[PDB]
Design a protein around this ligand. Structure first.
Ligand SMILES: *[C@@H]1O[C@H](CO[C@@H]2O[C@@H](C)[C@@H](O)[C@@H](O)[C@@H]2O)[C@@H](O[C@@H]2O[C@H](CO)[C@@H](O)[C@H](O)[C@H]2NC(C)=O)[C@H](O)[C@H]1NC(C)=O
Ligand SMILES: CN(C)CCNc1cc(-c2ccncc2)c(-c2ccc3ccccc3c2)nn1
Ligand SMILES: *[C@@H]1O[C@H](CO[C@@H]2O[C@@H](C)[C@@H](O)[C@@H](O)[C@@H]2O)[C@@H](O)[C@H](O)[C@H]1NC(C)=O
Ligand SMILES: *[C@@H]1O[C@H](CO[C@@H]2O[C@@H](C)[C@@H](O)[C@@H](O)[C@@H]2O)[C@@H](O)[C@H](O)[C@H]1NC(C)=O
Ligand SMILES: *[C@@H]1O[C@H](CO[C@@H]2O[C@@H](C)[C@@H](O)[C@@H](O)[C@@H]2O)[C@@H](O)[C@H](O)[C@H]1NC(C)=O
Ligand SMILES: *[C@@H]1O[C@H](CO)[C@@H](O)[C@H](O)[C@H]1NC(C)=O
Ligand SMILES: *[C@@H]1O[C@H](CO)[C@@H](O)[C@H](O)[C@H]1NC(C)=O
Length: 527
């Protein structure tokens, strides 16, 4: 048996056999009072001490959310749906520590993505036991509120001030600060890493003064706060909160009386109205997201970035080759996971209206103009691939590159990767390529299980990524120094070098999507 005394009491974990070794998992440790009743929509309250032994031997409840039901029974979509009961009682976290217990181990804290509407730490592809085993790091992940329940906002009002899910995350980093040394970890050596909205979360923790002292370094996979979906303005955040109140019949004049009304609503009724608070929506709509609350986030984040107002430290940043393809099967006409999705020009044009619904005719014309000037206009995938690149470059790749340029300009080491390996177990079809979210299983080292049907080439790729990620966490330098590997150079603003990750080679290249990203970061924001 293994019992750890924490600041709030005793917790019991479980023993894992990993690779002829042992990892101690503590699954589902609460880190806040459950945000129920009069605590719904409020900042997370701290937890009162218990005197018994908490059995942290099972993943806890996932936070309430809407489920992806577009492909019932398809593992490619459902592997991302919650795998534990949904509940408002969901502020819990997990710890994987090496066995035997470490002394002063570097700590990795994972923050999942899901557009701030979905996600959960209990998912199979976020299992931290491999990293604990292979690199002798401690892995921490937490559940944080999503959707309106985590990001509803009436700015100023503390009954619904906004960013609660970010404060959930933040209270969890505090738990690691106050408690991780008892588990054998070094609170002075903590690296946040996350993917998608999780990566955007990590980038905002770099900006939040209340998070400065809670971590050392940051890793951003396929996400950053300057992505166009990441931060809601205070205008539309309030318009959304009001629209939700009308839909629930919760319209009042005393804006506090509205919150009280939304608090007597069942988590369902709230969930099932979240989609209509926006007039026009897209597959990437963030109905309720981060906003400038004046507490977690004190100014519009693009100004903070532009003027150097962030924690100075090292960042690891990167993106996947086909970030955009995943969203094209959730609405774009002519697309399907069950056929090769050759579309026409008229189909491409109609697909911009879905992804850019509130954009001028000229704005949509300008996207078509920059992406549809081909070398071989006879290639029948031209429009299929253009639209994927359009959605990927706009929503993920270019904001990630612009974040790294701006951050490094203040003197910090930065490392940029380009993940271009398509998993051999990937259940989506081939035209979708190296999809959004499918580097994650390699970061967590799932291909290290020989039992798990991956190729040998993928085991080696995972093994080096796991080494580079961990060397970055421990030492701020993501090299693999032994197995004659390519040195990963720092990303500088003039030369802009980046590292490719794949089973074939591993190359240094310069200036990713340079021509595409000039369009998105310099022309298009004017339209
Ligand atoms: C690829 O498929 C799309 C989507 O069609 C669905 O998937 C197919 C595999 C099959 O099961 C269909 O019955 C499904 O509807 C096709 O797009 C549709 O095309 C039809 C006729 O071409 C049109 O009336 C619909 O509006 C289209 N959209 C939808 C949402 O059904 C597309 O034509 C297929 N393309 C190729 C090249 O195979
Ligand atoms: C990253 N991993 C969890 C990949 C696993 N798959 C998915 C699927 C979806 C999705 C499901 C259904 N309809 C549309 C999108 C989303 C999703 C939802 C909302 C978003 C809002 C703003 C930016 C990105 C967003 C992404 N994210 N990830
Ligand atoms: C907590 O756990 C104690 C030890 O039992 C171990 O954990 C439970 C969850 C079972 O899986 C069991 O097989 C393990 O050996 C229990 O004696 C105790 O009753 C539990 N208490 C609560 C409140 O769950
Ligand atoms: C702000 O909210 C306005 C209120 O309109 C209501 O909400 C929209 C989403 C629809 O459901 C509509 O029929 C409702 O009456 C919207 O009209 C308006 O477009 C919203 N956005 C802006 C930018 O003003
Ligand atoms: C390095 O590679 C190992 C297997 O390759 C063998 O060991 C290396 C160090 C070389 O001597 C090579 O010629 C051998 O064939 C893996 O077991 C090991 O985990 C790898 N390490 C990393 C960090 O990728
Ligand atoms: C852990 O390492 C830090 C420096 O990173 C040191 O100051 C601290 O005392 C160490 N503590 C233990 C218990 O090893
Ligand atoms: C709204 O109602 C609450 C609770 O009854 C009260 O404290 C508050 O002052 C009211 N505000 C306004 C503007 O009427």
């Amino acid at each position: 048996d293994i019992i750890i005394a924490t600041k709030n009491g005793k917790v019991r974990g479980m023993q894992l056999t990993v690779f002829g070794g042992t990892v101690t998992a503590f699954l589902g440790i609460p880190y806040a009072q459950p945000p129920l009743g009069r605590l719904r929509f409020k900042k997370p309250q701290s937890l009162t001490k218990w005197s018994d032994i908490w059995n942290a031997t099972k993943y806890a409840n996932s936070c309430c959310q809407n489920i992806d039901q577009s492909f019932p029974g398809f593992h490619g979509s459902e592997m991302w749906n919650p795998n534990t009961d949904l509940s408002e009682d969901c502020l819990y976290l997990n710890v994987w520590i090496p066995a035997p217990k470490p002394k002063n181990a570097t700590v990795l804290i994972w923050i999942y993505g899901g557009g701030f509407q979905t996600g959960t730490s209990s998912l199979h592809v976020y299992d931290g036991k491999f990293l604990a085993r292979v690199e002798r790091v401690i892995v921490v992940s937490m559940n944080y509120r999503v959707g309106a329940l985590g990001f509803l906002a009436l700015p100023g009002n503390p009954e619904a001030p906004g960013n609660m899910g970010l404060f959930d995350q933040q209270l969890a980093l505090q738990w690691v600060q106050k408690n991780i040394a008892a588990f054998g970890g070094n609170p002075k050596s903590v690296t946040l890493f996350g993917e998608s909205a999780g990566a955007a979360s990590v980038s905002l923790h770099l900006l939040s003064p209340g998070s400065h002292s809670l971590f050392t370094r940051a890793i951003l996979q396929s996400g950053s706060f300057n992505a166009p979906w990441a931060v809601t303005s205070l205008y539309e955040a309030r318009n959304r909160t009001l629209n939700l109140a009308k839909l629930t019949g919760c319209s009042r004049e005393n804006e506090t009386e509205i919150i009280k009304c939304l608090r007597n609503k069942d988590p369902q009724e709230i969930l099932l109205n979240e989609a209509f608070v926006v007039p026009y929506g897209t597959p990437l709509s963030v109905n309720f997201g981060p906003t400038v609350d004046g507490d977690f986030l004190t100014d519009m984040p693009d100004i903070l970035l532009e003027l150097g107002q962030f924690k100075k430290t090292q960042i690891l940043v990167g993106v996947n080759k086909d970030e955009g393809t995943a969203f094209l099967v959730y609405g774009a006409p002519g697309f399907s996971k069950d056929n090769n999705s050759i579309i026409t020009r008229k189909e491409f044009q109609e697909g911009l209206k879905i992804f850019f619904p509130g954009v001028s005719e000229f704005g949509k014309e300008s996207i078509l103009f920059h992406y549809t000037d081909w070398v071989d206009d006879q290639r029948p995938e031209n429009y299929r691939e253009a639209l994927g690149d359009v959605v990927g470059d706009y929503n993920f790749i270019c904001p990630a590159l612009e974040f790294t340029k701006k951050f490094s300009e203040w003197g910090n080491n930065a490392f940029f990767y380009y993940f271009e390996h398509r998993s051999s177990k990937l259940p989506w079809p081939e035209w979708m390529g190296v999809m959004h979210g499918y580097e994650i299983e390699f970061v967590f080292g799932l291909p290290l299980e020989r039992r798990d049907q991956y190729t040998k080439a993928e085991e080696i790729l995972s093994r080096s990524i796991v080494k580079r990620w961990a060397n970055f966490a421990k030492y701020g330098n993501p090299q693999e120094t032994q197995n004659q590997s390519t040195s990963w150079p720092v990303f500088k603003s003039t030369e802009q070098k980046y590292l490719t990750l794949n089973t074939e080679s591993t190359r240094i290249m310069t200036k990713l999507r340079a021509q595409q990203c000039r369009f998105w970061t310099s022309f298009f924001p004017k339209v």
